[PDB]
A paper describes a structure:
FMDV, a small non-enveloped RNA virus (genus Aphthovirus, family Picornaviridae), exists as seven antigenically distinct serotypes and many variants and sub-types. Structures of several serotypes determined at near atomic resolution have revealed a capsid composed of 60 copies each of four structural proteins (VP1 to VP4). A prominent feature of this otherwise rather smooth capsid is an exposed flexible loop (∼30 residues) on VP1, termed the GH loop. This loop and the RGD motif embedded within it (residues 145–147 in the O serotype) comprise a major site of neutralization by the host humoral immune response and mediate FMDV binding integrin89101112.
Subsequently, for O1M only, we tested the effect of 2 mM Mn2+. This resulted in more complete decoration of the O1M particles than with Mg2+ and the Mn2+ data were therefore used in further analysis. Although the icosahedrally averaged density for the GH loop and integrin displayed little detail, localized reconstruction enabled us to deconvolute distinct modes of integrin attachment, despite the variable occupancy of the integrin2324. For each virus the two well-resolved classes corresponded to distinct poses of the integrin, for PanAsia these were termed A and A′ and for O1M, A and B. The integrin portion for these complexes was resolved at 10.8 Å (pose A, 4.9% of sub-particles) and 11.5 Å (pose A′, 4.2% of sub-particles) for PanAsia and at 8.6 Å (pose A, 5.9% of sub-particles) and 12.3 Å (pose B, 6.7% of sub-particles) for O1M (resolution assessment uses the ‘gold standard' protocol). The slightly different binding mode on PanAsia (pose A′) shows the integrin ‘moved up' and rotated 12° away from the virus surface whilst the second binding mode on O1M (conformation B) shows the integrin rotated by 158° around the vector normal to the virus surface at the point of attachment, to bring three integrin hybrid, PSI and EGF1 domains together around the icosahedral 3-fold axes. These modes of interaction demonstrate the extreme flexibility in the presentation of the RGD peptide. In each of the structures, the orientation of the VP1 GH-loop is unambiguous. The GH-loop is pulled away from the virus surface, raising the RGD peptide by ∼20 Å above its position in the reduced O1BFS virus where the GH loop packs stably on the virus surface.
Author numbering:
A (entry chain 1): 1 to 208
B (entry chain A): 1 to 29, 32 to 503, 506 to 594
C (entry chain 4): 15 to 39, 66 to 85
D (entry chain 2): 12 to 218
E (entry chain 3): 1 to 220
Write the structure that this text describes.
């Protein structure tokens, strides 16, 4: 289909333009609420873990596919394998309130304890990248520093802990898993597949 | 001004080991022992070569240098299949400060990995020997790690001992090359250290933490000094900052009681290591320490326009409170770094004040080295030197720099005068210059009567029947000097008459009938003023011509260096600024 | 509705299960459905 | 059949080579009457006019991906930038319009994009800049690109001193290919304008 | 008595993709309102169908340069979503997290030359089974299409989905190196004074493009 090449309105030159017809297409597996509510592993610290969704890795499925959105809204439910007692704390409480048991602890029931948390952020919709990010500010005191203070790729790290779902604290968490349900996404961002060095990225597919 | 340059105590070491980078005295509190640390010598630990050791040279009887290593433990482990410490090429022997029986053999270039990641942080460690106990002191080895910690601290750079048994350590590379001076008593070192614990942390840890942003890369603690600088008796913790204020140089003198700043100084030339080598000692006479700041990389403003790297040492004098007077002491030869080998000498001649030795490493002929001696007086410190020294052996690839490691204020040859351990790491040679016994000689010439009549006619010339004018010459000799040396001083008294008369002399003796007389007068030291009186007459009237020139009697005596050796076999020397010859006059009326 | 697969009603009501949304007083499905197709000029068979 | 002359307030902008205006992410504004401001907002109608700015000089030696990122709002030294130093919380849309005037004998093209919250990009990421509100400019067809976007954001009113939501991005997709009869160097300008600003909360005066 | 049950075996383990929802622990939370907030997408294909994204050619560029010689092959790339040319596309960004697809793939072809340079092109689909064509004479016998550069400067050609099976794998096989899903070839046929001038290409999801069976790429 010949078009106006720069107006950037959507054009879909379908397969009927050179004979033929289109079939019924189903898109349930690419829905944004279906593809995001499954469990993903993140690395835990020893005791205190803020329940930020942007600490999911960038190589995994719903971490690299959550970063497709600029703005997201999703209720989080976690599943954590721990020992001791695990106290969840809402958004913006002091971190000394992790020790108190009036906050929603889960006693140890073997092997793991999954529990559904609400969206406790003050904002209408969370975010992934801030502009300008890391601005006390802009920038605390000096601070420098030396030689690697200028050329550094560590400025895309958020500072306000308001896009967090809260924090969990146990004696020693071993593996804590995120999933995000009722997920709404807004304003898409680019998604990258890895770069082939060959003619085509041939990997060993599964076979009998 | 009494260093034994003729036949000094030669000390050598292994090849390529830099024998003479850190030396110090040691006394088993008799006997004496020298401490010469070689940073690139062969070690007894398997798989580790050129690590470093502390060779103790025996000066008594025969020079017996013995390579000694305190904590000779191998590379420890922490996790699994990973050495916790890397003692390979650790340069063990960069700063070895001792005090009586304690031997502090520090090592700033001691590497140590992080307890959380496989790295290699040079944190430095010290090996202290308290009398007969072997302990390890390393304050820059605990929770602090690389970057925001004490990874590059290199604990054991600027070390010194006080009077209250407090070990003063100073690392310039602490916290992003800022610096930290940790001083801990020996009680916490011998009672608080544990070889099983890797995070050594003492209780009373008096030091300085991080500051603002302009203090970064300042080397806080490049040179340390002890003494009173505020009025409390306890030795303070002087800190040298070579990189202060756009690379100028400031000295931060901290208190040796609760860690508090006292006074601040100002450098002279930009980028000159204003505080590389300091020495706090009395020079004016008030029992107060006086820090003399060194400056190796100083360039004096010459008359030809182009600056010349000669170095500069500032002589500061402390009065009652803290009014330090700065006295600019320029260098000498070009490319000498006058201000690197500065060591107090103390009572070198027992003249009532202390002395100090400042040697130029890269200076001298053929880039060897000249040791400049600075003796004290009543006012302050002398500017001009008193004795010029030279090197002995040659070098290979590293520059010679004769005179780098040296100490003092400790008697070693057993006589009362401390020697000077001139240790040169470039030529791998440590030469010990012994202090010669300074003799305070007091001569005297009493020629009476003063006026001499031409027609006096008093005595009688033997052999003839013609009377002539005569006069009595009574010259006295006296010797007085502290130290262990034979009192029987064999002085060679040379009697000379009429120094002006080139022409025929008019004054001659009677017992010898010759103007020049030779006398061997061996007097005693510390006893009474042994004097001698003789008669000398004048020539006849029909011999001379001029009748207005006074008779200048010139006596020149020289101590015969023969039987003046005892025990150590060292030849004594006379006092400084004291000629061994005198001359008087005798008026002749007309 | 999500990744649920239960025909039974939930046990916990609606407000002890999720966070309730509040009204105040979509795009790319309208953008992808307004796509031009066919041709631009007079076609032949 | 073409109405191709826009205006915002008392300033107009007539272009004769407009391929069309692209409404990004919304055709209409959000509810400006929020509950996080207690009804103390008000529209300033005098902030809606254009203001010109310079971006870069697209020359023939520029390869793929010579991008330019100016954060909106930038330094407005007029009426709009007075509101930044006199009111704490404010929201607005934008309707940008970049111009790359050469002639119809140059070649190449440069993509224009309004992208929210843009920082720390890669040049491998530049292949998918098409996802945002975008509009191509090539001299063979047009001279301008006219993009219009509403207020996006984490929350309804914004503090522009500590946050810049939008980022006008122009990158060069094909390099500028001058010919014997083209124009050697083109200069990229832009006139940006706010849409329906709403301030809330008066600062004290600096005196 | 009480109601007897049988605590059945094999059931009840933790599955990471199950439709079981977790029990709540902290209720009565009212979110701030979010209604009619701009820029919402529902499915990831609508972003991939309404927003085309560039391709990758030799020299890390999206444009292909006209060729002033006897050889007339502008580009010839195999047809897979794990290809080298398709790599920076958003369409192959989310097709890295699935196993198999079906449907058409739109290719958008914008010509960025000056007003005096004219050229015409062709793009053909060579189904698998023999070698891909190297001349526009040989590629006339494919399912091809031609267009020339005039006033409307953009051309959209929908790649047909021809396959034996109903779904084709989005991951090209690691050992099998023949690429038996298909080639797509685009040529130039002629050009008038179009030397050094470009043809920037794009790719979008088709009208009936739909993916299937999500897995975790894990940056592989
Ligand atoms: Ca450097
Ligand atoms: Mg640099």
């Amino acid at each position: 289909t010949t078009s106006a090449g720069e107006s950037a309105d959507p054009v879909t030159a379908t397969v009927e333009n050179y004979g033929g017809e289109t079939q019924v297409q189903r898109r349930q597996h690419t829905d944004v609420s279906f593809i995001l509510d499954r469990f993903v592993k993140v690395t835990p610290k020893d005791q205190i873990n803020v329940l930020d969704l942007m600490q999911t890795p960038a190589h995994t499925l719903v971490g690299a596919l959550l970063r497709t959105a600029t703005y997201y809204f999703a209720d989080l439910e976690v599943a954590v394998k721990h020992e001791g007692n695990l106290t969840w704390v809402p958004n913006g409480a002091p971190e000394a309130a992790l020790d108190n048991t009036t906050n929603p602890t889960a006693y140890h029931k073997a092997p793991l304890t999954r529990l559904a948390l609400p969206y406790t952020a003050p904002h209408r919709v969370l975010a992934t990248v801030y502009n300008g990010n890391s601005k006390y500010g802009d920038g605390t005191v000096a601070n420098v520093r030396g030689d690697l203070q200028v050329l550094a790729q560590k400025a895309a790290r958020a500072l306000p802990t308001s896009f967090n779902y809260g924090a969990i604290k146990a004696t020693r968490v071993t593996e804590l898993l995120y999933r995000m349900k009722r997920a709404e996404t807004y304003c898409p961002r680019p998604l990258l597949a890895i770069h082939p060095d060959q003619a085509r990225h041939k990997q060993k597919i599964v076979a009998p | 001004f009494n260093l034994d340059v003729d036949s000094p105590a030669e000390y050598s070491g292994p090849e390529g080991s830099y024998f003479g980078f850190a030396v110090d005295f040691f006394v088993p509190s008799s006997r004496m022992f020298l401490l010469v640390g070689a940073p690139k010598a062969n070690t007894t630990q398997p798989g580790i070569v050129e690590g470093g050791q502390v060779l103790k040279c025996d000066w008594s009887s025969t020079r017996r240098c013995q390579p000694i290593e305190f904590d000779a433990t191998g590379n420890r482990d922490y996790a699994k299949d990973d050495p916790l410490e890397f003692k390979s090429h650790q340069w063990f022997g960069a700063s070895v400060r001792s005090k009586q029986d304690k031997i502090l053999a520090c090592a700033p270039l001691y590497h140590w990995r992080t307890e959380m990641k496989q790295e290699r942080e040079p944190v430095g460690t010290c090996f202290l020997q308290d009398g007969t106990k072997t302990v390890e002191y390393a304050p820059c080895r605990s929770q602090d790690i690389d970057a925001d910690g004490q990874g590059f601290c290199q604990g054991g750079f600027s070390i010194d001992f006080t009077k209250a048994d407090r070990v003063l350590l100073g690392g310039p590379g602490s916290f992003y090359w800022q610096g930290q001076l940790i001083s801990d008593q020996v009680a916490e070192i011998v009672s608080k250290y544990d070889p099983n614990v890797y995070s050594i942390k003492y209780n009373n840890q008096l030091a300085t933490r991080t500051a603002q942003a302009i203090f970064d890369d300042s080397y806080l603690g490049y040179s340390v000094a002890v003494g009173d600088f505020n009025g409390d008796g306890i030795d303070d913790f002087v800190s040298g900052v070579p990189r202060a204020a756009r690379t100028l140089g400031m000295v931060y003198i901290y208190d040796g009681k609760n860690m508090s700043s006292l006074y601040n100084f100002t450098g002279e030339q930009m980028a000159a290591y204003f505080g590389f080598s300091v020495a706090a000692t009395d020079i004016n006479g008030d029992d107060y320490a006086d820090v003399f700041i060194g400056a190796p990389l100083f360039m004096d403003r010459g008359s030809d326009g182009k600056l010349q790297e000669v170095g500069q040492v500032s002589v500061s004098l402390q009065r009652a409170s803290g009014d330090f007077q700065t006295t600019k002491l320029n260098g000498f030869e070009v490319f000498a770094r006058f201000g690197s080998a500065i060591a107090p000498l103390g009572d070198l001649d027992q003249d009532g004040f202390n002395d100090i030795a400042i040697a130029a490493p890269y200076g001298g002929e053929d880039k060897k080295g000249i040791v400049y001696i600075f003796n004290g007086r009543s006012t302050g410190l002398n500017a001009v030197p008193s004795q010029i020294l030279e090197g002995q052996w040659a070098a290979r690839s590293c520059p010679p720099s004769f005179g780098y490691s040296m100490k003092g204020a400790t008697d070693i040859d057993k006589n009362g005068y401390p020697d000077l351990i001139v240790g040169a790491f470039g030529v791998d040679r440590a030469i010990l210059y012994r202090a010669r016994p300074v003799i305070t000689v007091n001569a005297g010439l009493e020629v009476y009567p003063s006026i001499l009549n031409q027609d006096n006619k008093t005595c009688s010339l033997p052999g003839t029947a013609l009377k002539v004018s005569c006069f009595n010459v009574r010259f006295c000799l006296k010797a007085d000097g502290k130290g262990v040396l034979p009192r029987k001083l064999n002085f060679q008294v040379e009697l000379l008459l009429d120094k002006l008369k080139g022409a025929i002399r008019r004054a001659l003796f009677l017992y010898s009938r010759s103007p020049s007389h030779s006398k061997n007068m061996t007097i005693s030291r510390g006893g009474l003023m042994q004097c001698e009186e003789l008669i000398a007459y004048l020539r006849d009237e029909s011999e001379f011509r001029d009748k207005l020139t006074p008779i200048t009697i010139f006596m020149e005596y020289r101590l015969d260096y023969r039987t003046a050796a005892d025990t150590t076999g060292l030849q004594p020397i006379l006092n400084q600024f004291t000629p061994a010859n005198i001359s008087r006059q005798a008026h002749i009326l007309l | 509705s999500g990744n649920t697969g239960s025909i039974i009603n939930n046990y916990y009501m609606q407000q002890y299960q999720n966070s309730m949304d509040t009204q105040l007083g979509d795009w790319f499905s309208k953008l992808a459905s307004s796509a031009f197709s066919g041709l631009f000029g007079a076609l032949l068979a | 059949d073409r109405i191709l002359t826009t205006r915002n307030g008392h300033t107009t902008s007539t272009t004769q080579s407009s391929v069309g205006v692209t409404y990004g992410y919304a055709t209409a504004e959000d509810f400006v009457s929020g509950p996080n401001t207690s009804g103390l907002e008000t529209r300033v109608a005098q902030a809606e006019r254009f203001f010109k700015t310079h971006l870069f000089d697209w020359v023939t030696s520029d390869p793929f991906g010579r991008c330019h990122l100016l954060e909106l709002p930038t330094d407005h030294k007029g009426v709009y930038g007075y509101l930044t130093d006199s009111y704490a919380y404010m929201r607005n849309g934008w309707d940008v319009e970049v111009t790359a005037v050469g002639n119809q004998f140059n070649g190449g093209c440069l993509l224009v994009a309004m992208v929210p919250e843009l920082c720390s990009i890669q040049k491998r990421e530049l292949y998918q800049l098409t996802l945002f509100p975008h509009q191509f400019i090539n001299p063979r067809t047009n001279m301008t690109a006219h993009i219009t976007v509403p207020f996006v954001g984490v929350n309804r009113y914004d503090q522009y001193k500590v946050h810049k939501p939008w980022t006008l991005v122009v990158m060069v997709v094909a390099p500028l290919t001058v010919n014997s009869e083209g124009a050697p160097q083109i200069k990229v300008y832009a006139n940006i304008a706010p849409t329906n600003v709403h301030v809330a909360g008066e600062f004290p005066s600096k005196e | 008595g009480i109601f007897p049950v049988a605590c059945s075996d094999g059931y009840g383990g933790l599955v990471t993709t199950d439709p079981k929802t977790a029990d709540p622990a902290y209720g009565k939370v009212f979110n701030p309102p979010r209604n009619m907030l701009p820029g919402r997408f529902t499915n990831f294909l609508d972003v991939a169908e309404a927003c085309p994204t560039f391709l990758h050619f030799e020299g890390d560029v999206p444009y292909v340069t006209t060729k002033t010689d006897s050889d007339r092959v502008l580009a010839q790339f195999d047809l897979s979503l794990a290809a080298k040319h398709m790599s920076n596309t958003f369409l192959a960004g989310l097709a890295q997290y699935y196993t198999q697809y079906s449907g058409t793939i739109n290719l958008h072809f914008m010509f960025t030359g000056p007003t005096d340079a004219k050229a015409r092109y062709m793009i053909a689909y060579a189904p698998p089974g023999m070698e891909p064509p190297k001349t526009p004479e040989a590629a006339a016998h494919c399912i091809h299409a031609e267009w020339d550069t005039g006033l409307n400067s953009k051309f959209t050609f929908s790649i047909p989905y021809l396959s034996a099976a109903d779904y084709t794998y989005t991951a090209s096989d690691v050992a099998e190196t023949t690429n038996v899903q298909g080639w797509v070839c685009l040529f130039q046929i002629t050009h008038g004074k179009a030397d050094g001038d470009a043809l920037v290409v794009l790719a979008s999801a088709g009208k009936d493009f739909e993916l299937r069976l999500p897995v975790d790429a894990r940056t592989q």
